Amino acid sequence: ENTPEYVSITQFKDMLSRYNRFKEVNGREPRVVFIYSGGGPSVSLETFKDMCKRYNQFLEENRREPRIVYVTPPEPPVPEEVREMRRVLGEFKTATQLYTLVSRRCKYKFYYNDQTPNREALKKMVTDGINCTDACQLFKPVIEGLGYSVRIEHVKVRCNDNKWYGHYFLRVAGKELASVSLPSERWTVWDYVSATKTGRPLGAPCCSRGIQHLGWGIVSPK
Amino acid sequence: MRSNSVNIETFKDMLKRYEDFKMKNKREPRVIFIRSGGGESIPLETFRDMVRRYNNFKDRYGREPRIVYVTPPEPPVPEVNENTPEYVSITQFKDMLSRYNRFKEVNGREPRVVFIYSGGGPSVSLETFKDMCKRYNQFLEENRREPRIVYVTPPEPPVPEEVREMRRVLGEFKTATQLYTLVSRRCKYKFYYNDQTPNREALKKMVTDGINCTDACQLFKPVIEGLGYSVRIEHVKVRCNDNKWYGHYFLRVAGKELASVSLPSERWTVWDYVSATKTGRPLGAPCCSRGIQHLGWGIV
C-alpha cells in the first residue's frame, strides 16, 4: 500500500484523536502516527507536525477547513520541471552543466514577493531576473530530478561593501559534486547569485568576506 | 575506564584498520580496537563521529588535530523550516538506506523513523521507508537501472480538478450516497484488463462503453475524498467465478453519513462501482453476495 500523498480532513482529525489518546495514556508524543485506525501506513511525528501546519495555514488563509490535508507538500511532476528548464536553457544532464547554462543566460533581481509559479519564474529568469528564494525553489527540484541531493541553506554572507546580507543558496551532493556522506554544511555550494550576478564559480558563495549558517530550508513568514 | 581521547597517531592507526576491515569484510566493523592487539574498542558510531570531527578540523585549520576526543553520538536536531518531501533523489535515498543498514547492524533492530538527512531534520516512518525500498526495488526490476528519484509518497491526482471533471459528467452532487445513486442510473461497467487508463477518456467511457473496477476505483477515490470522506481501495476476492472466486477492487469509505472513521478500514462502508452499475446491489454491498476475502490495500 502506497503511503498516501494526502488524506481526507476526516482522516486527519482521526489521526489527531489517536495522537492525543497516545499522549493521554503515555504522557508523551508518539514517534510515528498511524494514518488509519487498525494500523498500516504511518507518518513520522515530524511529518505529522508538517500536516498540522498545512491545516493551520489553509484555515488562516481561507477562513474554512480544507477537504484534503497533504502528507507531503504538493509539487508539479519532476520530469515536467526538468523538461521545462531544458526547453529554456537547453540540454543539460549534470549540476555543473546547469550552473554553466544559468551563468550564461539567467539574471538576478531582488524583490521580497516570493511567488514562484515555475512558468512565470522561468520567463522572468531570462529577462528581468529572479531573487534567491525563487531561484532556490526553482532549481532544487530540477537538480534533484537529475539525481543530486539538494538542501536549501539559509546563511549570512559578507560582501565587498563589508555589510552582511541574509541569503539562501543550494547545498548539493551526489555524482560529480560533494560526497553525500559529508555533513550537509560541507556539500557543494550551488549559488544562483554567484552564477548570474557576482561571477563566482560553482562551489563559491556569492560573496567572499564571510559566511555564517542561520538554518536549513526557507523561512516562510507567518 | 574508557579512554576519553586518543592521540593523532593512534587515531590514524584505528582509521587504517577500519578501512582495511571494510575492504576485507565488505562491511563496517561494529567496534574499532584502539590497538590492533588490544582490549579496549570504540563503538562504530562513536568512531564515525571521531572521523567527522577530525575531517571538520582539517577542513577548518588545514592541519591535523593533536587529539581526537571519544564522545558518543548526539541526539538529532529538529528542522522546522524543512518539510518531509514528496520525493528524494537517488543520491539521498541511498544515503538514507546506508544509515538504515548501519542502524540495524549496530543496534540489532530497525529504527522507528529514518531521517532524510543525516543529523536530524525531517524523517519518514519505518513503514514509509520500507514502502520506498519496495518501490525502488520494483523500479530496478521493471527497468534495469536505478531511478533518479524515489517518491516518499507516490503522487495522487489533485482533488479539486477531479471533482470538477466528475461534476461535468454527472452533474452536481454533495454526498457519497447521492453520488452512488447517480452512478447507478448513469454509468456503465465493462470488464477489461487495462492496468489503468484514468485520463479524461475514462470519464467518457464511463457513460458510453463502460469502465472496469480498477479504473472506477482510481476515478472515484479522489472524487469522494473531495466530498469530505476518507477512502481506502481494498483488493478482495468475491465468491463468483465459474463458481470458484474472482478478484476484485472496491472502495471503503468513512465519514459524514457513511461509516465511522475510527473503525478499522475493513469495517468501513463498501462503495462498489460494480454493484451500482452491473449487479444492481445497494450501497454498502459488494458486487457479489457469496462474498469472499481480503487480499490487500491499494491497486496491485
Gyration radius of chain B's alpha carbons:
28
Distance to chain A for B7, nearest Cα, Å: 23
C-alpha cell at B10: 593512534
Burial state string for B280-298 with b = 16 or more CB within 10 A and e = fewer than 16 = ebebbbbbbeeebeeeebe
Does A146 contact B at CB distance below 8 Å?
A: yes
**Torsion angle in degrees (nearest 10) through CA of B169, B172, B176, B177:** -100
Active site residue A167: yes
Q: Which residue has the cell 572521523?
A: B51
CATH of domain B159-297: 3.30.2140.20
Distance of alpha carbon B195 from alpha carbon B214, whole angstroms = 7
- Nearest chain B Cα distance for residue A43, angstroms: 5
Q: Enumerate long-range contacts of A201-209, CB under 8 Å, 24 or more apart.
A: A202/A95, A202/A96, A202/A99, A205/A155, A205/A157, A205/A167, A205/A169, A206/A157, A206/A159, A206/A167, A206/A169, A207/A157, A207/A158, A207/A159, A207/A160, A207/A165, A207/A167, A208/A160, A209/A157, A209/A158, A209/A159, A209/A160, A209/A162
| Contact predicate A13/B255, CB 8 Å | no
**CA separation for the pair B154, B299 (Å, rounded):** 12
Percent helix, strand, coil in chain A, to 5, is: 40, 20, 40
In chain B, domain spans? 5-69, 87-151, 159-297
Cα of B95 to nearest chain A Cα, Å: 7
CB-CB under 8 Å, A183 with B127: no
- Contact (Cβ atoms closer than 8 angstroms) between residue A119 and residue A180: no
Residues 206-265 of B with CB under 8 A from A: 225-232, 254-256, 261-265
Give the phi and the psi of residue B27 in degrees, each rounded to 5.
-155, 160
CATH class given for the domain over A78-216 = alpha beta
- This structure's resolution (Å) is 1.9
Nearest to A46 among B84, B94, B266 (CB): B84
